Amino acid sequence: SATAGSMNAVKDSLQRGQSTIDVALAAGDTITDLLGKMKEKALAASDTSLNTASF
């Protein structure tokens, strides 16, 4: 009965880790969006046709 009643702490630790991973995945989605946008900005800046103010 003691070993069976000890399981609640384990389940709580797993839910806590799942919540931390969810927050990390949300932050990673934001980082991926910003990364794609900077890749667009860099590919646009790489062209030699642009002038100084656009650059």
Which residue ranges make up the site for a second copy (CB under 8 A)?
A: 1-2, 5-6, 8-10, 12-13, 16-17, 20, 35-36, 39-40, 43-44, 47, 49
Q: How far is the CB of 52 from a second copy (least distance, A)?
A: 15
Cβ-based nearer residue to a second copy, 6 or 52: 6
Residue found by looking up tokens 């656009």 in the block = 54
Task: Return the amino acid letter for 36.
Answer: G
8 vs 30 by CB, closer to a second copy:
8
Distance CA 35, CA 30 (A): 9
| CA distances for 32 relative to 3, 5, 36, angstroms | 44, 42, 6
